[PDB]
């Protein structure tokens, strides 16, 4: 009956037990700030925001850390294309991303560590990796050696043999020596930049300790990004680093993966010009977070229509509460409605406890809404207690899913 989560590390559903009672330390991989956020970022971060909201709803104190990679080769390439500075562009798109997450009613992360503010910690981490023998120096930087970590391939399941101044093809850069014209920082191994995988591990170990509960990200990050993270962390610490791994499914456009490389990406700013943020949240939440999400305009229209139906139900409840009277007795209709509301709340909690299955939770919500509409149609004089219980259930739904916020604000 407890909350179970799907662990990608074991590829199975396990009962959720945090390391420290009453606290969930969750880390999610933030976006790379070089262009406007698209629907994949919205899907991933809305799913993890709903996970955070539900964990807080169950009584946990959630410390959520989302990194802000503000230096990368893609960022430098974009700055060179636009003739800007790789830092001004990063700051501008960090602000754009924060505004977009604020618009989508996503709760801001508790800490937003930046790479440029944690260079020394990364350098110390790479030095500690080198003194343990897990790193070597190449002609163009410091590289991590995969074969010295026997448990490589634990998360994704990719074998080393399949992967086969870098010694081995499967090795990866921990510190890259600087090219002329690009940003760089002083280091004992030469002036350069950090790698694309050391940053998240360094920030997570700095702000959450050597071990925390939940590491999150996109499904593409399973390999090589998160495998690199777990390899580096267990090489540096020698013990388990992340207890539960959560990955959101891909967003699909006409049967292919949504990404900026193929150019089939729709920005959040573009969607906001056509749909309300709660409509986008409902469209994201209509599918399980591990399942692929097919992006169609008809799907968004259907989500809009369903959200409008729920809005109409809430407005009808509000209107009926103006003339609702106290119940000195309950008929068969009142007991039927109460039973449906109670069963809907139980099914909502059961669905959210089953790997955050928001689809069944929405099914329960719609069952409760249909029952309330039937009760308001059939009851000659609506009872105040029934409407109050319905509003309590919808308030729980609002707190968990982040919808109906304007209705319950008033």
């Amino acid at each position: 009956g407890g909350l179970k989560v799907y662990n990608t590390l074991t590829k199975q559903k396990e009962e959720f037990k945090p390391l420290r009672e009453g606290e969930v330390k969750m880390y999610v991989c933030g976006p790379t700030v070089y262009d406007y956020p698209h629907l994949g970022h919205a899907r991933t971060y809305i799913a993890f925001d709903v996970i955070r909201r539900y964990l807080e709803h169950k009584g946990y104190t959630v410390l959520m850390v989302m990194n802000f990679t503000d230096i990368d080769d893609k960022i430098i390439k974009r700055a060179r294309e636009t003739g800007e500075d790789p830092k001004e562009l990063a700051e501008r798109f960090i602000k754009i991303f924060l505004e977009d997450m604020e618009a989508l009613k996503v709760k801001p992360a508790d800490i937003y560590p930046r790479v440029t503010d944690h260079i020394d910690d990364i350098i110390e981490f790479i030095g500690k990796l080198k003194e343990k023998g897990y790193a070597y120096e190449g002609s163009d930087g410091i590289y991590f050696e995969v074969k010295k970590f026997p448990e490589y391939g634990k998360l994704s399941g990719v074998k080393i043999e399949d992967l086969q101044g870098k010694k081995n093809p499967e090795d990866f850069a921990l510190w890259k020596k600087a090219k002329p014209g690009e940003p760089k920082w002083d280091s004992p191994w030469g002036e350069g930049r950090p790698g694309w995988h050391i940053e998240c591990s360094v920030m997570s170990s700095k702000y959450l300790g050597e071990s925390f509960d939940i590491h999150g990200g996109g499904n593409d990050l399973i390999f090589p990004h998160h495998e690199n993270e777990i390899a580096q962390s267990e090489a540096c610490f020698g013990h388990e680093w992340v207890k539960y791994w959560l990955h959101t499914g891909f967003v699909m456009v006409k049967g292919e993966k949504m990404s900026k490389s193929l150019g089939n990406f729709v920005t959040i700013r573009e969607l906001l010009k056509r749909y309300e943020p709660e409509v986008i949240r409902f469209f994201v939440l209509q599918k399980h977070y591990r399942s692929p999400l097919e992006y169609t305009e008809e799907g968004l229209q259907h989500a809009k229509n369903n959200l409008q139906r729920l809005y109409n139900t809430l407005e009808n409840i509000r209107v009926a509460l103006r003339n609702a009277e106290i119940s000195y007795t309950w008929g068969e209709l009142e007991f039927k409605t109460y039973e449906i509301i109670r069963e809907g709340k139980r099914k909502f909690y059961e669905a959210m406890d089953d790997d955050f299955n928001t689809a069944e939770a929405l099914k329960a919500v719609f069952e409760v809404a249909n029952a309330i509409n039937k009760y308001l149609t059939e009851a000659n004089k609506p009872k105040e207690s029934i409407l109050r219980k319905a509003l309590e259930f919808f308030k729980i739904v609002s707190e968990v899913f982040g919808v109906f916020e304007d209705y319950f604000r008033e």
Copy 2:
């Protein structure tokens, strides 16, 4: 650890396991509506409202039924004194009690059954008792026989030998034949009125099923009222009737019990004329619901001062949130404040799980408030995440205790 409640039937703390998953059926003995409510009713109903709020906060659907004894010999006495019809006085004081409970921010019960609306059910229950060999017909009505029920006295601990148209002194009235000038109802045993004990059992069995979870009331209701209800229900049904019995402690005035018999009672409306509803709620919640409450003006002043301190803390948080910035990193002060807030929430839940101990919960609340005041004093630029977590904790406290309503409603 799960939620534990103090069962008076076993006189010990037991893990709270409802009969049906996700549903708690609670029954509270209502007030005798013939005079203005006093502080004892406020204490009892505020304690049970906090219990209901916490049970709903834990995910349970709570169906709470509070009965109304609109016909009573004391009501007839007051009606004869005032020269008013008993029913009109009963209805007027029903309205007065509802207004007083609405003022005290007490959530209304789902069902409010009335004795005058359930005469036929009471007659059916008495007939079922008679045909089961548990009641007899006396000179002035129908009386329940205690000797037929061997388990009498398991709640209050009172022995039958200590208690020794009634066959036995320990017998009690089930139906009382109508005296001239009194309201009367037709019955197979003659015109009369129901007793004060049959109503609660009849209404509870009617609206909460055959057996429900929680039966509540004052400490004076342990004997004879609730023992009589146990006897009637277990004689009529032949199985367990109530799983958990909760009784609020007495309210003391100058070391003696407060009741209208001694004339040392203060009405709720007088305190409302002198204090705010949340101050009265805080004063009630300063002590455990099972512990006696000493009514002093200095105690109310201290509760008002503590609630004003909490209001000042919330106002400081609100003011600081206007200039609060996001967190790119956390210093030792931010981590210390976060740790204290997390531990305060954990201790709040641990205290409320320990037989609804509101005193320890309030101590945790004040610890969190002191920590956040210290943080706002020593923070040169407060972080938005820390203030948001503090506001979430205080929102949980507001939802459970029913205080801070104005701050979070706006």
